[PDB]
Design a protein around this ligand. Structure first.
Ligand SMILES: Nc1ncnc2c1ncn2[C@@H]1O[C@H](COP(=O)(O)OP(=O)(O)OP(=O)(O)O)[C@@H](O)[C@H]1O
Ligand SMILES: Nc1ncnc2c1ncn2[C@@H]1O[C@H](COP(=O)(O)OP(=O)(O)OP(=O)(O)O)[C@@H](O)[C@H]1O
Ligand SMILES: Cn1c(=O)c2c(ncn2C)n(C)c1=O
Ligand SMILES: Cn1c(=O)c2c(ncn2C)n(C)c1=O
Ligand SMILES: [Ca+2]
Ligand SMILES: [Zn+2]
Lengths: 701, 146, 19, 49, 48
């Protein structure tokens, strides 16, 4: 492994057709028999596991001891025919025989698996890099053909990236993706975050915001993976049928500490299922609620429950009320333990980067414009400011950066460290008392700033007050609107055109007020809604009553104000009133209301079209390097090749995590360069409109 | 065939065979397929309308029972909003169908108590359940066909 | 239909339409 | 797939397919990996001989 | 159609440079091409 690492480090930085790669393949040819023998060893001891895991080989096992005879061993690998006769003889020589002609298949497979993994991966990386750099190499074709099973087995662990950082030349970098990283990436918890991020970054559209939010999402995703790893392991019949159909369509002393930890893990694992079942209990309690009836006297208005089989459902609502309350409180605990760390990490990172570059407090001019920026002040003084963030030396780094200019002693008291003696001692080298108050006030203040936590707190208030009046559980029915995506879009369509909607509502109010003014000034005689002549009720003699009547009847009816107006037949102002009624109809019923309706339905249509356009733009071009699929429709099955190998999105987060894991001194030239480039917070290593094929199409073949 | 055989048992059942015109013509096939093309959003939109009318009917039962008289004769006052089930059925049958809000069915306010709260409730019902939900259903269906 | 309700409605309308 | 499992071990399986020799192709393709007897039992053929 | 016109005004202004016409396409290959182009190279106010 050290040999091949040295070899591929020597080859690193070569051009598509360089003397280094030509001598590489020439030397590989010069040891054709030896490299072929090594590749054969790898191939046989790799296909060994596939042979042994197959059911065909398992069928030949004929011993309760679980050990197969040498004769049956040879017969099984003759039936498979993957291994040649001399190869089977060599494997028999390699067998760990127990002197009874019986060899353990499992031990023989597993013993030679772990040590050869790294070297097999490195050899696969070397062969792939030679094939990619020099395609027109007939000699290398034979070696690539012999390296068939090893490459296939190590392909899922292998990943390729094409960052460009040196001499404006695009190059390829290979690394190892561990099974744990990909397995945890396959978790749908981070898949939903991937969907949300890929929607949000495309929605924003900022040129630098693309890479900036990409790296921010990568850091947040890594933090979420850390949290997951730390936490893992008659009318009644018709009404019942309608409720069932709706549900179907919608659905489809240390022991105390140990118990607390177990309870927290249990709540965090199934927070989402807890929310779903809480929604179902809300449905059930509202349905049970659907059977009330009022009467004059108790069995002094009485809200008394009555239906068939009272014992089935009257205690049911009573018990499910408490059950829903307890479930919802557990939901709060789970949300506090699950996602609040993620948002606090976001805010910590944002404030730290602002303090570093924008220097919000080294300039000490927040401006009090934003309440969040003002509330950001109290937490710097706490020593536990950077604890949640992976980095905790940002305060010291900013001190060393800017204390020569603004005064080291000035920011010594500002950023919360004890003194310069604190850094001097750092260089020199009860739990209740460890809790810092101001950090906790800042923490729960930003908890009370987030929208989701306030929605859940309002849920708490409603659930707790539902015992005051059982009808208050109808507020929990809004989770359907706040749940499934379609109703979330429906609700957001109302707020999407909020400015236009409220302005046109104000315009309608202005028009109706003007019409009320003229109606009072001229037509106060006609508004006679009374029936008995003894006590007439003039609907329009005061401004407020007339305006309220107009807003209540004229807009709502649709026929106009003239529906409630007495018929203007054979009287003065008949034409002056037919004009008024026709213009009321034409300016309040057919235009303004139609304008509002069109605004709402077009906002919803635009939201749906944007949602579809996000998915479309997802495929029209790759957003990492801003390259369309036109260059790859020129070849069969091309854009899939780009997405899978050239500029794959999933492999970048694996690359960042692999950079995080391994130590600094083992970084190669490309790895160290990209580490430095990320540390400087400058993003030019990304391809940025230049793929490898664009540069090397002439010799790509 | 099953409908046709049923038709011999009762001729009335032959009317169901008239739907073949829809499959005969491409335009009619598209017209019927419009409903099932965007049925997912339509079902949840109907559910949202049901939820909203349920909220409004529980509000009316809690505070507006005395305005829901529908019987002209005073000898037998028929309280339409006397129970949750009856009030909800009455709303979902009359208010949405009228198109002009529940004010056509509810006795008009005469300056009594809760007059402002009554007019706010009626205007917000009209707005939300007429200008928004029904319009969205219409637009969704016509836009799917288009 | 009192002074308070009309005042609140007008205040909200003016606050929205001022900007 | 659960329903189409029922038509595997019966004669005249490719009644409408142009190729009536798909059984031999499937055998020659996968019998070495999956055993001749297992493929013979699955496909409904009498025997390899 | 009116609202589409006001939206199109902003869209065309943001995707094309008024002074020289074409923009945000050839400059897009260079990082931050359009922003630098409109700030320094081709700006409406600097001509006045
Ligand atoms: N860097 C990228 N550039 C362009 N397209 C990409 C990139 N990474 C992924 N894709 C696209 O992702 C598609 C795969 O999406 P798919 O339908 O499998 O689900 P997904 O929403 O990505 O979720 P998951 O794979 O986690 O189940 C590919 O067809 C490809 O077009
Ligand atoms: N000749 C031009 N002059 C100004 N902006 C231009 C020109 N050509 C293209 N643009 C684009 O228009 C944007 C500015 O347009 P506009 O005047 O509508 O914005 P603004 O909000 O008033 O500006 P800012 O907030 O940057 O002061 C530029 O950032 C650029 O993307
Ligand atoms: C430990 N660690 C991280 O966890 C990390 C990081 N950059 C991003 N993340 C998430 N760096 C540089 C780091 O050292
Ligand atoms: C005889 N025959 C067919 O009958 C056939 C076919 N491809 C499809 N069909 C139906 N080929 C290639 C073929 O040779
Ligand atoms: Ca080194
Ligand atoms: Zn690319």
């Amino acid at each position: 492994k050290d040999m091949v690492v040295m070899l591929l480090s020597l080859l690193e930085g070569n051009v598509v057709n360089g003397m280094i790669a030509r001598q590489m393949v020439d030397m590989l040819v010069e040891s054709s028999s030896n490299v072929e023998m090594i590749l054969k060893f790898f191939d046989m001891f790799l296909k060994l596991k596939d042979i042994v895991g197959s059911e065909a080989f398992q069928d030949y096992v004929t011993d309760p001891r679980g050990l197969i005879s040498k004769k049956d061993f040879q017969k099984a690998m003759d039936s498979q025919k993957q291994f040649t006769g001399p190869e089977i003889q060599f494997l028999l020589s390699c067998s760990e025989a127990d002197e009874n002609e019986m060899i353990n298949f499992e031990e023989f497979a597993n013993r030679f698996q772990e040590p050869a993994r790294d070297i097999g991966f490195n050899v696969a990386v070397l062969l792939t890099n030679l094939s990619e750099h020099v395609p027109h190499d007939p000699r290398l074709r034979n070696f690539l053909e012999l390296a068939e099973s090893i490459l296939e087995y190590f392909r899922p662990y292998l990943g390729r990236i094409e960052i460009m950082g040196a001499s404006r030349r695009i190059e390829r970098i290979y690394f190892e993706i561990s099974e744990t990283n990909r397995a945890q990436w396959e978790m749908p918890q981070v898949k939903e975050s991937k969907r949300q991020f890929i929607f949000d970054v495309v929605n924003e559209g900022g040129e630098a915001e693309k890479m900036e939010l990409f790296v921010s999402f990568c850091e947040d995703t890594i933090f979420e993976m850390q949290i997951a790893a730390q936490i893992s392991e008659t009318a009644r019949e018709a009404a019942t049928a309608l409720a069932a159909l709706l549900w179907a369509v919608v659905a489809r002393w240390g022991e105390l500490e140990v118990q607390r930890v177990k309870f927290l893990n249990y709540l965090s694992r199934n927070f989402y299922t807890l929310r779903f079942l809480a929604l179902f209990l809300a449905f059930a309690i509202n349905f049970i609620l659907l059977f009330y009836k009022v009467s004059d006297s108790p069995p002094n208005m009485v809200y008394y429950f009555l239906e068939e089989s009272t014992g089935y459902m009257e205690p049911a609502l009573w018990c499910l009320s408490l059950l829903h309350t307890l479930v919802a409180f557990l939901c709060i605990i789970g949300y506090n333990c699950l996602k609040v760390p993620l948002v606090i990490f976001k805010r910590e990172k944002e404030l730290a980067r602002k303090l570093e570059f924008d220097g919000l407090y080294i300039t000490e001019q927040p401006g009090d414009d934003d309440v969040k920026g003002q509330w950001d002040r109290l937490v710097l003084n706490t020593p536990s400011f950077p604890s949640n963030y992976w980095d905790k030396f940002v305060k010291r780094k900013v001190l060393d950066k800017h204390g020569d200019i603004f005064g080291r002693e000035r920011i010594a008291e500002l950023l919360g460290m004890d003194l310069a003696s604190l850094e001097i001692t750092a260089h020199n080298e009860t739990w209740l008392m460890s809790i810092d108050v101001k950090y906790q006030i800042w923490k729960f203040g930003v908890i009370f700033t987030d929208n989701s936590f306030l929605y859940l707190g309002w849920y708490m208030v409603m659930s707790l007050l539902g015992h005051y009046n059982n009808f208050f559980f109808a507020a929990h029915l809004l989770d359907i609107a706040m749940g499934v995506k379609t109703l979330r879009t429906i609700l957001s369509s109302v707020t999407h055109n909020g400015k236009q909607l409220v302005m046109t509502v104000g315009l309608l109010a202005v028009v109706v007020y003007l019409y009320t003014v003229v109606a009072f000034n001229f037509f106060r005689k006609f508004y006679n809604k009374s029936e008995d002549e003894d006590e007439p009720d003039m609907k329009c003699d005061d401004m407020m009553t007339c305006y309220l009547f107009h807003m209540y009847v004229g807009v709502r009816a649709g026929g106009g104000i003239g529906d409630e107006i007495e018929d203007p037949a054979g009287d003065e102002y008949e034409l002056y009133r037919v004009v008024f009624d026709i213009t009321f109809f034409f300016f309040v019923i057919v235009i303004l209301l139609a304008i509002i309706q069109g605004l709402i339905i077009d906002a919803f249509g635009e939201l749906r079209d944007q949602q579809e356009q996000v998915k479309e733009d997802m495929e029209t071009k790759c957003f990492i390097c801003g390259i369309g699929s036109d260059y790859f429709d020129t070849t069969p099955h091309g854009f899939e090749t780009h997405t899978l190998e050239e500029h794959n999105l999933a492999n970048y987060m694996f690359f960042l995590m692999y950079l995080i894991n391994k130590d600094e001194t083992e970084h190669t030239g490309q790895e160290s360069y990209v580490w430095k480039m990320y540390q400087e917070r400058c993003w030019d290593f990304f391809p940025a409109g230049d793929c490898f094929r664009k540069q090397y199409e002439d010799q790509l073949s």
